Amino acid sequence: SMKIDVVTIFPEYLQPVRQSLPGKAIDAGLVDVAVHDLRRWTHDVHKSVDDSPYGGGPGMVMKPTVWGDALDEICTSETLLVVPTPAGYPFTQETAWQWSTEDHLVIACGRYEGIDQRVADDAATRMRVREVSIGDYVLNGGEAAALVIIEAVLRLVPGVLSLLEGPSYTRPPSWRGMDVPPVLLSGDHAKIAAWRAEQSRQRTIERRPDLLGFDS
Amino acid sequence: SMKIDVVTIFPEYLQPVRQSLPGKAIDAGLVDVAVHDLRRWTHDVHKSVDDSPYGGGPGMVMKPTVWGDALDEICTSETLLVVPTPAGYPFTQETAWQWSTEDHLVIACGRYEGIDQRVADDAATRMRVREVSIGDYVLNGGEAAALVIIEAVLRLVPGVLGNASLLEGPSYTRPPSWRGMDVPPVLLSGDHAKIAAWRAEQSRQRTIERRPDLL
Ligand SMILES: COC(=O)c1ccnc(N)c1
Numbered sequence: 510s511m512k513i514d515v516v517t518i519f520p521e522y523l524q525p526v527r528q529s530l531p532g533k534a535i536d537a538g539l540v541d542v543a544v545h546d547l548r549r550w551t552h553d554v555h556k557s558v559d560d561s562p563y564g565g566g567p568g569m570v571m572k573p574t575v576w577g578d579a580l581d582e583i584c585t586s587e588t589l590l591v592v593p594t595p596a597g598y599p600f601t602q603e604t605a606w607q608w609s610t611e612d613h614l615v616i617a618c619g620r621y622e623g624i625d626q627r628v629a630d631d632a633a634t635r636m637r638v639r640e641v642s643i644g645d646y647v648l649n650g651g652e653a654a655a656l657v658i659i660e661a662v663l664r665l666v667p668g669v670l671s672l673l674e675g676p677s678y679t680r681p682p683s684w685r686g687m688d689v690p691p692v693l694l695s696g697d698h699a700k701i702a703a704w705r706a707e708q709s710r711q712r713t714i715e716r717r718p719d720l721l722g723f724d725s
Numbered sequence: 726s727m728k729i730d731v732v733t734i735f736p737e738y739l740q741p742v743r744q745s746l747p748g749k750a751i752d753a754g755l756v757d758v759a760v761h762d763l764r765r766w767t768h769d770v771h772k773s774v775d776d777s778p779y780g781g782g783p784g785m786v787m788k789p790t791v792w793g794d795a796l797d798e799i800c801t802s803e804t805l806l807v808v809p810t811p812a813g814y815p816f817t818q819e820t821a822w823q824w825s826t827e828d829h830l831v832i833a834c835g836r837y838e839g840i841d842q843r844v845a846d847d848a849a850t851r852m853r854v855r856e857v858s859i860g861d862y863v864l865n866g867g868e869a870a871a872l873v874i875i876e877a878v879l880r881l882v883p884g885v886l887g888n889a890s891l892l893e894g895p896s897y898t899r900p901p902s903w904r905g906m907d908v909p910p911v912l913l914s915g916d917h918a919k920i921a922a923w924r925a926e927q928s929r930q931r932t933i934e935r936r937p938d939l940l
């Protein structure tokens with residue numbers, strides 16, 4: 510069993526984790542996902558979680574005090590603290606495999622212009638911390654990234670179940686005048702394997718030449 | 726100004742995103758996000774959306790006849806059809822900027838084994854189609870990728886979500902000392918040219934450490 514805790518100021522945005530495979534993994538008892546409202550750990554009546562950045566700049570930074578209290582309660586020395594951020598190390602398939610064997614993930618979701626760096630620095634004195642980016646784009650908050658990470662990891666957990674995959678087809682064999690590639694209907698496993706390997710390598714050079722060690 | 730239609734067998738997955746739209750943007754008619762259950766376009770009593778792959782192999786492939794009907798109803802010639810797939814072209818910040826001025830996005834959410842390729846190929850003969858990946862990992866379905874794409878795009882449309890090279894370096898706020906860690910004194914110095922130079926060096930170091938590909 511894995512435990513995943515997600516900490517966020519928008520707990521309602523994490524509801525989709527109840528759908529499809531994360532939902533089915535939860536129902537199978539393979540994982541427990543708990544979502545926590547960061548404002549639970551505030552003490553002012555304003556429940557303030559942010560303030561202006563030292564040194565200037567646009568926007569607001571999440572305060573370390575509130576985060577520290579939340580993580581103190583939720584984390585242990587065995588926790589893997591995951592902090593989604595566009596400035597993170599890349600989260601990849603390899604990362605997903607690695608984290609799939611973890612006992613406890615805590616995902617700290619930032620909003621505004623990010624979380625005071627001392628939160629991660631303080632946590633790293635007690636536990637393993639991983640600041641990660643899920644791709645080359647910016648979001649308003651870490652919540653959607655948390656959903657991506659949870660899905661990519663949970664589908665790899667024992668008991669739940671390079672190159673680009675080429676096109677796939679199913680019935681009927683002809684549709685709107687478009688035919689399924691005849692080799693796929695031929696029953697020749699060697700020819701199908703070869704055609705699929707070729708399609709995979711062809712799609713990869715077109716869409717992801719970087720995966721084969723080429724420019725762009 | 727932008728309409729987004731999402732087609733999925735898990736429509737509830739997209740509902741917090743709809744709720745997260747500020748009323749002011751909806752009232753101003755800046756944005757409309759509609760979610761459609763793909764099973765609306767199934768043909769049989771069992772509401773079948775997938776079938777075994779031609780050529781053999783594991784998993785299931787989503788049916789072209791079902792998807793074809795769904796897109797026929799939902800798309801027009803002006804539609805940008807977005808198909809999240811781990812086998813796609815990379816979705817990047819540049820892509821998000823490009824798509825932020827579109828009138829109509831339709832996002833087709835499929836299982837990772839894929840939608841029958843004839844669906845995208847047929848659609849591409851009468852509209853613009855973009856098969857895209859949001860990163861180097863596999864999900865079970867495209868729904869979480871759809872959420873990422875919707876958020877990355879809509880936050881670039883003025884007034885829609887409520888928000889106003891090298892990696893950004895660390896940020897700090899009050900208090901100036903916390904658990905034995907002080908905010909870097911340069912940030913309190915009132916020397917704003919020096920602060921900018923310090924931030925540039927922090928950005929350089931962080932980029933070398935975390936994303937050497939960017940240099
Ligand atoms: C606020 O979080 C983000 O913007 C984010 C998080 C993780 N990966 C990204 N590419 C963006």
Ligand SMILES: COC(=O)c1ccnc(N)c1
Pocket residue numbers: 809810811835836837838857858859860861862863864865866867868870
């Ligand atoms: C099923 O969809 C995916 O697995 C997917 C979609 C978009 N980008 C990815 N990296 C994966």
